[PDB]
Amino acid sequence: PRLICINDYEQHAKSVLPKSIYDYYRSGANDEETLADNIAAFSRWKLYPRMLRNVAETDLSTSVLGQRVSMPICVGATAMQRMAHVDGELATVRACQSLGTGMMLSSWATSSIEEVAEAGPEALRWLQLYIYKDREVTKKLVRQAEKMGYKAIFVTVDTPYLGNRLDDVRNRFKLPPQLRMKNLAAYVAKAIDPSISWEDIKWLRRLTSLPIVAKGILRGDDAREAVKHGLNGILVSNHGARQLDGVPATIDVLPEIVEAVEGKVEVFLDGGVRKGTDVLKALALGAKAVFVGRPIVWGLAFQGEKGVQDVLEILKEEFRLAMALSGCQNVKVIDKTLVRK
Amino acid sequence: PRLICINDYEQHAKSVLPKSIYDYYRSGANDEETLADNIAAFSRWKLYPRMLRNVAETDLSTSVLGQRVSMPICVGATAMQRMAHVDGELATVRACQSLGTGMMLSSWATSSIEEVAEAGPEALRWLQLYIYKDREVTKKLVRQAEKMGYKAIFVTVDTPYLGNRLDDVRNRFKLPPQLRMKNLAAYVAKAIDPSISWEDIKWLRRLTSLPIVAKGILRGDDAREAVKHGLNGILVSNHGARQLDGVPATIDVLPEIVEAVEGKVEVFLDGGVRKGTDVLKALALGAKAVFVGRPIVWGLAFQGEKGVQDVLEILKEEFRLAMALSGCQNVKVIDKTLVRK
Amino acid sequence: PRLICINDYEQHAKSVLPKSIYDYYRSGANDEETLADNIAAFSRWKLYPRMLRNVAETDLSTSVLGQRVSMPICVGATAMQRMAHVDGELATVRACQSLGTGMMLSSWATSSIEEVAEAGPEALRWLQLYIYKDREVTKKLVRQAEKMGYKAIFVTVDTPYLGNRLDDVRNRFKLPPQLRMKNLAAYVAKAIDPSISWEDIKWLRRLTSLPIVAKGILRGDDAREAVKHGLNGILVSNHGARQLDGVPATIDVLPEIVEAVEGKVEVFLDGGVRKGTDVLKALALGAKAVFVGRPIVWGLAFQGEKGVQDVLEILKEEFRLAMALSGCQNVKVIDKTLVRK
Amino acid sequence: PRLICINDYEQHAKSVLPKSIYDYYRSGANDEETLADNIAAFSRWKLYPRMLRNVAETDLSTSVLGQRVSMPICVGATAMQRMAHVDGELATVRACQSLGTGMMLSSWATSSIEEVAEAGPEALRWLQLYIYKDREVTKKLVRQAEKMGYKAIFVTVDTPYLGNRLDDVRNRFKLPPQLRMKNLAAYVAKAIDPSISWEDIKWLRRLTSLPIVAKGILRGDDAREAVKHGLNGILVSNHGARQLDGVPATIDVLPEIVEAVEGKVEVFLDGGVRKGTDVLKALALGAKAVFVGRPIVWGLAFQGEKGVQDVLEILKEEFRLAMALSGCQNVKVIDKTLVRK
Ligand SMILES: Cc1cc2nc3c(=O)[nH]c(=O)nc-3n(C[C@H](O)[C@H](O)[C@H](O)COP(=O)(O)O)c2cc1C
């Protein structure tokens, strides 16, 4: 293989993965309107580059919730990574450690919170949390994250029930027989609490002093409520278009959310990030950093840790080039005048 | 067959029905611009879901013209259902009775008003009426509906003449030889009155104390006239895109009609409803309930009563999921802020 | 053949005509952007039909420049009709006489002004005129039209040079050897005057008392100048998209032109009329009548006079149905509220 | 071959050039969104032609930076023309001399500044300059241009680094073994200075009294800065969509730049010019002249000097026709009312 951009990695993954596994990772909810729009929406935002600014020294570094990262490009939570590669989440965290960026670990990982901390002790690591009907197991996951040097909790708030991904139903999706959630619609309905409310966010805010990011907010009123509840960031996310279909693209709702929080908390984005220009557009519209979901799984499917490292390095280099061609020597000078819809 | 969404049922129906029968049900008028737009328009309306609202208890129940239904999803009038399945309208009403929703019976049914009441005595049933040049047969249909416990009249107002559906002309459409309208362009021209005016609506309003819904209104001025004539609802309908081609999608004209009637009568929608999110969008824009036409015929073509039950259950479950993912525990909290075009 | 709409006639014509002849009639200028848009633009204008208006009696009759016609659908000038059928313009005028509508005869006809008057003595006939460098032959054509009972002059104003139709260049277009202009880019450059100005319109206005329509106006300022020069109508036309490519669709510029002339002269439209709803949209936006170009040639290619009669009857019937379904009993009640873009 | 429009020349070039060479010339950056939009954007600008203006005498002549040219259509800088035809830049300048238009010579030419002046002594010639890390070689190129009768410097300002053109990476692009830059991403990174700032523009303004045009400006604020630094024109350019992908089409940003410079310097356009109507639209929006890149390379690939002459003659004739059909006898009367988006 000669893979030189993120799409090439997806095409390689489709070629090597069983159909059911490829479909599980690629699929969006229902007719997949939002899945298409998470990508298409980035193309509608046009870039207005400044010339002659001195971009010999391009510095991609930034910080996420007070922790330094090498680039505003971080690994989002994607379940059951051992389906893509035998090393699964341990491959991913090692690549993140190499790159100097952070990994958000799925609550539905095929590797334990401790296993991932042991594989990536110097890596920036965060835990994505679902509030389970069993609040004891929920609390155990938070306490394990604290003990094992995870630096934030990303609480997923858009999944009271699992979205309806048709290909998983056609393929009756399940984990391969040798794998386990080491810490799907039927499983969520049995385990994930559809009752959670802002009162549960008050509970979680009381449970941990770790920073908490609300993941899956799409409305400014909800973002302002998250700020009121003492949370420390908002990840603007439509869950990779896998929950409610027909919501807007995340890049289209990002400006409303940035306006609504009035700088009180960091705002992040995921959904459809494939290219360095996507990263640049998200930062111009006020995101501190973006998260990538599917591209990491395609990296694993190609070559485990090295394939994840390659995907992150391609995004890093595309982002550096996009910054340099736009006249940006660092992330602090990426401003709103760089983009227009 | 493994049919898990309404499109799958259409694909199955195309596979099993004779071409002329499939084309009769699928076809729209002329170049079928409105037929495409009734579906496309739903995709342009984007959903803005609220998180963390407590959706453990989702209640889909509502009422139509004062009668309770299990869901805001009802069966619209589609002619000559015995072409799709031997049990035709009797299969449909039995499924409606099972589901707890209502059936609008076509004036051009392959089963009599009494036959359908006998098959579905506990089912909520309404009669769709055409004003025939023969006012005696028109009055006989209304009196039969009253005697047989139908609960409303839906008077179709957009069919002074039949629309021009090219495939029916190519196929010279007729009923199979064993079937009869037990109570097509050539038939309408011989039987349906192209002279009807608001004076005929005054006549019908005087004829029955049953609630009367005007079906096929697309303009706010006409909706206000229907309110002035003492009618009890408006079904925003372009007749499944089979009459005048190039009218707007019903979801696009629904907000004008809801504004125009100022809450004086219930407003309903049909045309292009295929998914639970379509139902949610229509209710967010102020419809009390929606009607489905073609999907019911595809249910019959698959397995008669069980196929209609399956299609209604798929719509019910998609609608519950869409409500839950949007933060709606019941239909009363589905508000206009959930959608933006 | 079973031809039931105008597109079917085009498909039949492509099947029976030599490629060069089909391409000559079908082609637009350059990349054919306007050719596509003359049709696409009609689909963007949506219809807002009134219900319950009494359309038992639909009267399609109107008048063009004071002469009664059976329908607001008239035959536009298309050159060299004997390439499509041996009877050419004589077939066309006979069909117009049968239908009770008017024929605009091309200055580049394969039949003489007298021949066409002899074939269609009771037909409403107008002459389309090019101002030739030879003003004597120009004056001879006008005087012949007057002597032979033609009722107006349509002076084409958008052709100082011929547009560049690539397929004609690829096919090195010429008349078949047995045919003559009985009264192409190379021919225009030799014969049509690229110098004509409003001073030539003053000359033509002085030459004849016949009504004069300016054909090919696309700007309101030019329409107001035509009114100032004493002309009696404006045919909003982009020459069937065969002159300057990238001009707007005629249905899109029609409202500006109707506004600009402030009711001082009749406004007509051609370009992309294929369906009765196209006619209805043009009249709702203020055109008195529309002209059809290519559909008449496809009628000839099918069956000469009978094929032209069939195409005109299909347009008539589609227009009646569109009027009836929109609530219009006559052309005088077709109003601007029937359409929105 | 029968090539009658610029697209035909591209199709011919794809048929005769090695894939890597065709791809080098055709390719845009990354997903090639801007490459598509440079063409698509021209089609969105519609023309509003005036009739009856007297276009017997069409005069295409204009001036660029005070030098007369035969048409507002000039040859832009395209590297390494000897890859397309053995005579490369010498063929191009000879064709420019024949046509009476100007040639912008690439700093990355396969022919020297002196060689091209020797082949085209009477041709209007300008030098496109990159500011190399080696300011001595930069100054040598400027002094050579002055000594050899070049009339302006076009300083490229949008290339601190080379854009990422995927096909060149797939094909590991290099010059054929017999060719040299007689005066690619890896080469730029080694030779082109990513540090250049407006201070380097002050240096260049001090170095030469020749007119200097800033090539690659896309923002009005940058255009105003170029005016402040004493430059003499702005070439609105996205580098043929080969640098930052997702910038707007040049025809879409041209009006902002023309407004921003308030007539203080000439404004030019390149990017997507293929047709005479493209030239007309650019002049209506205020460009003095346009530059063509790829079409010249396709002319060379067809037949060297004669193929470049043919492409320039096709553009000239399409432009004359577009001017004549729009009512423009000369370039001075091409006004903003001819276009609307
Ligand atoms: C295969 C797959 C599994 C996912 N698993 C989880 C999960 O365990 N937890 C979670 O909160 N989100 C999960 N998501 C959502 C991602 O965190 C993220 O929002 C999404 O992948 C971003 O969009 P992208 O894939 O377009 O980059 C998953 C997404 C995918 C594609």
Ligand SMILES: Cc1cc2nc3c(=O)[nH]c(=O)nc-3n(C[C@H](O)[C@H](O)[C@H](O)COP(=O)(O)O)c2cc1C
């Ligand atoms: C096959 C077919 C038959 C129909 N028959 C009738 C009819 O008898 N009476 C009526 O008022 N509308 C009739 N309609 C219109 C439907 O009541 C309804 O407006 C339409 O089907 C809704 O759109 P949908 O098919 O996209 O759900 C018919 C529609 C179809 C597709």
Ligand SMILES: Cc1cc2nc3c(=O)[nH]c(=O)nc-3n(C[C@H](O)[C@H](O)[C@H](O)COP(=O)(O)O)c2cc1C
């Ligand atoms: C084959 C062809 C020949 C034409 N010949 C003439 C002509 O002789 N005189 C003229 O003024 N316009 C001529 N036109 C333009 C037509 O009068 C008319 O503007 C155009 O056909 C209308 O668009 P339609 O073909 O889409 O109906 C011609 C058009 C076509 C397609």
Ligand SMILES: Cc1cc2nc3c(=O)[nH]c(=O)nc-3n(C[C@H](O)[C@H](O)[C@H](O)COP(=O)(O)O)c2cc1C
């Ligand atoms: C093959 C190729 C080589 C180019 N080489 C150069 C170059 O040497 N210098 C430069 O400033 N721009 C260069 N450009 C950009 C062109 O000057 C010009 O901006 C662009 O070709 C215009 O768009 P067009 O190709 O759509 O006409 C190049 C473009 C192409 C396609």
Ligand SMILES: O=C(CSc1nc[nH]n1)N1CCN(c2cccc(Cl)c2)CC1
């Ligand atoms: O809420 C529940 C069960 S509630 C219930 N109701 C009926 N049966 N069970 N838990 C979810 C979290 N928990 C977990 C989280 C991640 C991975 C693993 Cl192993 C475990 C599983 C169990």
Ligand SMILES: O=C(CSc1nc[nH]n1)N1CCN(c2cccc(Cl)c2)CC1
């Ligand atoms: O208006 C008419 C006939 S008027 C007329 N003019 C010339 N011949 N007939 N009726 C329509 C309603 N009627 C009906 C409605 C539904 C089904 C059945 Cl069987 C019957 C049929 C007959």
Ligand SMILES: O=C(CSc1nc[nH]n1)N1CCN(c2cccc(Cl)c2)CC1
């Ligand atoms: O203006 C001219 C010729 S001017 C000229 N310059 C150099 N050679 N000729 N006429 C055009 C009208 N005329 C005509 C119009 C329609 C059909 C027929 Cl047969 C004839 C042909 C001749």
Ligand SMILES: O=C(CSc1nc[nH]n1)N1CCN(c2cccc(Cl)c2)CC1
């Ligand atoms: O800036 C440099 C080299 S700077 C450097 N750093 C490490 N190695 N070299 N020059 C560029 C211009 N120059 C040129 C311009 C056009 C063609 C030709 Cl032959 C030559 C080549 C060399």
